[PDB]
Amino acid sequence: SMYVIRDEWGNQIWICPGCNKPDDGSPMIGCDDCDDWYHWPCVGIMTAPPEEMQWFCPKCANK
């Protein structure tokens, strides 16, 4: 969410906080608290989670 940059058209490109690199067209998942977006491998995901399952990023999963 602060991990967002813009292109010449005003479009937004999200940056993965896990690897600190941009959306490169590969699958991504969004935190259900802070709405940062991550590449699947950077949070250990190989297949889609159960579609109803809540997902939270490592910062929001802290206790």
Partner: peptide
């Protein structure tokens, strides 16, 4: 979960 750009 909310996912984008999946196969």
């Amino acid at each position: 979960a909310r996912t984008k750009q999946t196969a």
